[PDB]
């Protein structure tokens, strides 16, 4: 199984409440009892959530921002980012037991979007992605890689 | 864990594609914001694409994100295409919007609202980076190349728009005629920070002097943004937001 | 359309448009419609807006549905920014050519260096046809006629596609091999020095040399073809000829002005002084893109927009003809639904309750004298 | 501020208290302190409490300054009570042109001067709080230098 | 210019467009004092509770 | 005894000379031979000196500064601060054998008082006060506290 | 008009004439609100005794 087809697939305030709450209320309490296969399965879903973030940012910060220049999406990617924060903080191990500084900057910067200074904070995706790579190479690091 | 060697390679390939997707789109969004709110005014209009201010400003504020992305990607994976993926993503977003909103919603002509080309600058910055992997050598030589080749890079596109025309008793360029004809309600003529002449410009040197000044300022901005990207590449584990 | 949002007093006393006339109301594609008239820069220019030392004559329309073929201030073409003097009167003429079918609100706007857009009154113009029939020919000094609708479009597409293809080829070349995790592990666990080796360096040298060489030949070809090029033309034009209006013989001094809150009426008291040798009668009160007319005195025949026109919205308590030399005090009331439709009654929310406008005085002969009034505007509640 | 207003602005000089009253910030301090201790996250504080401080400033002072905004016809010109007070009680060192106040703009749409300014102040206060948290963090060091 | 008398006799009346006459010497003074004292008392109560 | 009633209780240049000299000339040479009771007794006096500093700053920076706005104390709090510097550096232990950076910033910043930048240096009172708290909890730390 | 064409040391040569400021002053150059009457020569080979 591993990666599934989730990749292909007032209200803003409301949608944030359930989406953030649902991931947080269903939190895995025994993060120690994770098989690496189950870790790898859930690990893809976290990357899928970041994929939704990337689509939301591009739709939000690239399409609609200059659309004002020719002359919703900001809360949309705000919700996606914060939901994925609780998502990885609870489901993915090695990413809990401490807030990741780059990933926190990633979720806060574009959220509080002066835009030039604050659009720079989206560069934290690089540190986020290398941290998620280290999470990738925890149990399913090899072999093949480095061999 | 993971079962065997080949399916592990397949998993790594899937991760590669997904990471490429996420990095590409996040860079598109952020770099598009930065270019829009630092330089987008000059990139919008052909009559705005002057030879002093546009050439001076665009490389200075457009080398920001490629510097950081290069400093991260090279140092962490030996991938010499950060500047490339930044420029291609910016051009993709710019062109999609030019064709869907500037020409779809409104009806500004494409030859009037075409964006600027930066692929040669990205290519030079990426080669001078990987070849002679010295970051200082990169910031010295590749930044100069990026600054210098910008205007000659766009010369094939904008050269046909500089043909002199006698328009109702006044000499005008094709870009000037396009700007005069197709009205811009929010962008009048006086806002155009373009070459208006000076008593201290000697002979035919407006384009080269501006190009060299942009090259040096791009060296400085690259040197700054390399360190900004180096921190944007940390993996700090804070324990109390 | 960007008005009914700008500051009330700022619209009232910035620039007054009058004598406006539209050549046509309905046009087809490639037809030309001309907008004429005169605009007067107010003497009491607001401090928060910079003086029109550098200003542009623009047209307010929803996108380039009309192409601005020509524009004149006085008698000379004004394609670039111009300098306007405070208190002087100018006349303008803008030639517009239809490009997009449909109904458009064409506004004759003014743009000043440090004050943003100054929207004037607009008239609905209907355009019929199709965009495909539109043509924008122009003849260069080189001796060739090209259409600006598609000139250089093919060359721009070709060059942009070529550069994008070069970038895509580079990224694909470096993305054929495994990208992220194995390479990260190699560079972390000891020196990598295996991910960048021949012939990667040689092909990178090839890419760099090819990019430079293509750029050089492309710049030399763009120098051979189109060998005559000029830089972009810019620079504010000074010495703009103003209209030499005769000195008005009518002196008007305003003794307070009030308007009802809420209400649609503007009440004010006037002391008209009549000089010369003609019996005049007040006929119009143009305050901000709204013309309050007295039907018994003057009637509008210039096709001025209905929503901006008050046929009998101006009521004068004593509008009997005024003998020359004779001075009298009269009460003038201007009431119309447009006063609230365009939110001229929101000046109570404004931090500067002052108004300015133009009064048109007509005599038996039929000619008119233009006089200007300004006074504090005091709202009334009880 | 109040001791000086009552002892020098009103004692030495004679500017009226209703003319020289200071601004109120206790609601902002209270919000900043609750949003801090509750959800002790400093980032959450800098995001939410700073927004509250910026947003509640003008509505906090509205009960005090509202009576001073009653329109008055003063010798043919519309004036506010605060404007009349400033016109009457002279300030030798502070003429009228120095007043960096709302003078109108051609890019202010409808009734939005107070809210837009309040939100801009809230965001800038977020930024200033984020900076001054780190400035205070260093101002809190206990370094033992050995050679001034 | 010599001025004789006392400050207590000074009056500064003004009539608003609402239809009320108020003296600018003490207009809104009581309201300002009340609001400032209330907010200061709230702050003092908070600091005393935590002290 | 402990805390006494000292709490209730050209010339500027001259007063600085004796006040700074007197505390420095009477310096305790054997700082090792201090009973904790004697340390605690002298420790209150150092806090009393800081109390004089706080009164001087408020009288100097709050009353007289805006008094110019309506239109001595600066040297007064300069003298108090520098005198208390030698005072704690010589009398109080654990505060000698090295100049405290925050307390030095405290005594220098308001002294050289552009005022906006330099009024910020008075925030070093926080680090000064926590250092003086650590001096408090040297010998007479308990018990009671932490028990 | 130039008073003399060839002069010896310590001799005085006077330059007279009229200059007209153009109405259409370019925007990129500030208006001559603060201007100086100077003389362009390769170094102080002539000392500017007077200027009116
Ligand atoms: C790693 C380093 C990469 C360098 C990339 C440079 C590509 C080649 C462009 C040459 C242009 C030139 O020399 O010609 C100068 C002219 C401008 O002259 P002008 O006075 O404005 O008059 C107009 C003359 N027209 C009508 C023929 C254009 O060209 C340009 O429009 C571009 C000028 C800015 C770039 C200057 C680069 C100088 C070489 C740098 C490397 C040593
Ligand atoms: C943790 C967050 C704490 C938030 C504290 C805010 C307290 C409530 C104030 C509401 C004011 C309002 O909505 O009304 C808007 C009006 C101003 O409107 P105006 O266009 O200038 O016209 C004048 C209209 N008068 C005559 C009725 C005043 O009010 C004000 O004068 C204050 C405006 C700035 C503050 C905006 C806060 C918006 C809510 C923020 C939380 C989601
Ligand atoms: C608006 C700007 C945001 C400011 C940034 C501050 C947050 C950054 C750090 C962060 O996200 O951590 C908070 C937690 C992560 O777990 P912890 O911080 O370890 O604490 C968990 C317990 N807690 C849920 C009560 C916090 O994450 C969550 O638990 C969030 C999910 C629960 C919230 C759902 C309710 C919100 C509905 C609107
Ligand atoms: C109209 C809004 C619809 C949003 C639907 C949200 C779906 C629920 C979120 C979620 O928890 O996971 C959905 C998928 C699959 O991950 P799951 O495995 O279901 O997540 C929990 C992981 N666990 C099973 C091991 C405990 O994870 C994903 O990758 C789903 C990505 C959805 C894109 C984000 C849409 C947000 C729009 C505002
Ligand atoms: C505006 C230009 C960019 C400025 C960026 C400055 C970042 C400085 C580093 C940082 O995040 O500060 C961390 C501290 C909290 O630290 P602690 O809670 O002590 O965490 C222990 C581990 N750690 C010391 C290694 C972090 O501070 C905090 O309390 C966290 C503050 C919130 C950080 C995330 C948002 C950043 C927005 C720019
Ligand atoms: C204007 C904005 C604030 C800037 C504050 C900068 C403070 C930087 C840290 C500092 O005080 O510098 C210390 C050095 C002398 O060091 P050393 O004598 O090597 O002391 C050994 C122990 N130590 C390295 C941990 C300090 O430097 C010195 O020589 C001491 C300089 C005087 C410091 C006290 C006055 C500060 C006024 C702002
Ligand atoms: C004006 C701006 C001041 C610049 C800041 C530099 C001083 C900051 C560091 C400091 O206060 O240390 C000097 C001593 C503390 O002991 P040490 O610095 O360890 O050296 C003691 C021997 N010494 C008195 C000759 C210096 O403290 C003293 O001994 C001061 C008391 C003796 C001076 C009394 C004479 C002054 C009369 C005007
Ligand atoms: C007109 C000026 C009169 C200033 C009088 C200065 C008094 C002498 C300073 C002094 O050394 O201590 C006075 C008191 C009590 O502390 P002492 O115990 O007397 O100080 C030495 C400590 N030792 C006995 C263990 C060796 O320590 C204090 O807390 C006295 C605080 C006085 C307030 C500061 C006034 C400065 C005004 C410029
Ligand atoms: C203007 C560029 C300054 C760059 C600073 C580099 C600091 C690196 C610290 C690791
Ligand atoms: C102006 C550039 C400064 C970049 C900051 C980098 C800090 C790195 C510390 C690890
Ligand atoms: C603009 C991004 C620079 C990041 C600031 C560096 C602060 C890190 C200190 C630990
Ligand atoms: C603009 C705010 C910058 C804050 C820098 C934080 C650095 C902390 C280092 C410990
Ligand atoms: C602009 C805010 C910078 C604050 C400096 C804090 C430095 C802490 C180092 C321990
Ligand atoms: C404005 C106060 C910031 C203090 C400067 C931090 C420097 C400390 C380096 C050791
Ligand atoms: Cu309109
Ligand atoms: Cu006028």
TrEMBL record, chains A, F:
Gene3D superfamilies, per the entry: Particulate methane monooxygenase subunit c2. Chain: C (1.20.1050.50)
InterPro entries, per the entry: NH3_CH4_mOase_C (IPR006980), NH3_CH4_mOase_C_sf (IPR023349)
- Write out the residues that bind Cu(2+) 1: 68
Main EC class the enzyme belongs to: oxidoreductase
Q: Name one GO molecular function term.
A: metal ion binding
**Zinc in keyword set:** yes
Name by which UniProt lists this protein: Ammonia monooxygenase/methane monooxygenase, subunit C family protein
Species this chain originates from: Methylococcus capsulatus (strain ATCC 33009 / NCIMB 11132 / Bath)
């Amino acid at each position: 199984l591993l990666d599934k087809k989730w990749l292909t697939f007032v209200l803003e305030i409301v949608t944030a409440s359930i989406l953030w709450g649902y991931l947080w209320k269903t939190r895995d309490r025994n993060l120690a009892a994770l098989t690496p296969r189950e870790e790898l399965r859930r690990n893809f879903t976290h990357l899928v959530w970041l994929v939704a973030y990337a689509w939301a940012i591009y739709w939000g910060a690239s399409y609609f921002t200059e659309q004002d220049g020719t002359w919703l999406s900001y809360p949309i990617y705000i919700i996606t980012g914060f939901a994925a924060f609780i998502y990885a903080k609870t489901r993915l191990p090695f990413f809990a037991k401490g807030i990741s500084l780059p990933y926190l900057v990633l979720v806060v910067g574009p959220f509080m979007i002066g835009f030039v200074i604050f659009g720079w904070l989206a560069l934290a995706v690089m540190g986020t992605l290398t941290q998620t790579f280290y999470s990738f190479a925890q149990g399913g690091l090899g072999q093949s890689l480095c061999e | 864990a993971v079962r065997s060697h080949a399916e592990a390679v397949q998993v790594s390939r899937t991760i590669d594609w997904m990471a490429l997707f996420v990095v590409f789109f996040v860079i598109v969004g952020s770099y598009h914001i930065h270019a829009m709110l630092t330089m987008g005014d000059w990139d919008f209009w052909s009559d705005w694409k002057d030879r002093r201010l546009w050439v001076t400003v665009t490389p200075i504020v457009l080398v920001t994100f490629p510097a950081a992305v290069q400093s991260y990607l090279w140092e962490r994976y030996r991938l010499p295409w950060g500047a490339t993926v930044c420029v291609l993503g910016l051009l993709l977003g710019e062109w999609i919007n030019r064709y869907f909103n500037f020409w779809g919603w409104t009806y500004f002509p494409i030859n009037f609202v075409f964006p600027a080309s930066l692929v040669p600058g990205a290519i030079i910055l990426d080669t001078v980076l990987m070849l002679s992997g010295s970051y200082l050598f990169t910031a010295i030589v590749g930044a100069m190349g990026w600054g210098l080749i910008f205007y000659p890079g766009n010369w094939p596109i904008i050269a046909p728009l500089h043909v002199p025309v006698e328009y109702n008793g006044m000499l005008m360029s094709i870009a000037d005629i396009q700007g005069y004809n197709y009205v811009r309600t929010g962008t009048p003529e006086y806002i155009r920070m373009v070459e208006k002449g000076t008593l201290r410009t000697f002979g035919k040197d407006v384009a080269p002097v501006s190009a060299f000044f942009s090259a040096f300022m791009s060296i400085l901005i690259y040197f700054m943004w390399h360190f900004i990207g180096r921190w944007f590449s940390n993996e700090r584990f804070l324990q109390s937001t | 359309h960007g008005e009914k949002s700008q500051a009330a007093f700022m619209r009232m006393r910035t620039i007054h448009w009058y004598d406006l006339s539209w050549s046509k109301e309905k046009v087809k594609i490639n037809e030309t419609v001309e907008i004429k008239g005169k605009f007067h820069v107010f003497e009491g220019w607001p401090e928060t807006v910079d003086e029109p030392d550098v200003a542009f004559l623009n047209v307010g329309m929803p996108g380039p549905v009309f192409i601005r073929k020509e524009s004149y201030i006085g008698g000379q073409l004004v394609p670039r920014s111009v300098r306007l003097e405070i208190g002087k009167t100018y006349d303008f003429r803008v030639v517009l050519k239809a490009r997009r079918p449909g109904d458009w609100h064409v506004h004759t706007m003014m743009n000043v260096q440090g004050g943003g857009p100054i929207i004037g009154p607009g008239k609905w113009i209907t355009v019929e046809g199709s965009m495909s029939e539109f043509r924008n020919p122009v003849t260069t000094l080189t001796g060739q006629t090209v259409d600006l609708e598609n000139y250089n479009e093919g060359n721009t597409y070709f060059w942009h596609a070529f550069w994008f293809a070069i970038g895509v080829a580079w990224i694909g070349y470096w993305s054929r091999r495994p990208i992220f995790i194995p390479r990260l592990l190699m560079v972390d666990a000891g020196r990598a020095d295996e991910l960048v080796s021949a012939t990667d360096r040689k092909v990178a040298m090839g890419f760099l040399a090819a990019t430079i060489l293509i750029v050089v030949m492309a710049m030399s070809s763009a120098n051979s073809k189109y060998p005559i090029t000029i830089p972009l033309q810019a620079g504010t034009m000074r010495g703009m000829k103003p209209l030499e209006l005769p000195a008005p013989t009518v002196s008007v001094k305003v003794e307070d002005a009030t308007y009802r809150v809420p209400g649609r009426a503007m009440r004010m008291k006037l002391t008209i002084t009549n000089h010369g040798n003609s019996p005049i009668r007040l006929g119009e009160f143009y305050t901000a893109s709204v013309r309050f007319l007295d039907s018994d005195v003057y009637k509008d025949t210039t096709g001025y927009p209905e929503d901006l026109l008050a046929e009998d919205g101006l009521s004068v308590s004593d509008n009997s003809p005024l003998a020359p030399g004779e001075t009298r005090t009269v009460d003038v009331t201007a009431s119309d639904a447009a006063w609230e439709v365009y939110r001229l009654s929101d000046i109570i929310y404004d931090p500067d309750s002052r108004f300015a406008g133009l009064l048109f005085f007509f005599d038996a002969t039929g000619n008119r004298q233009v006089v200007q009034i300004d006074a504090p505007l005091i709202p009334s509640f009880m």
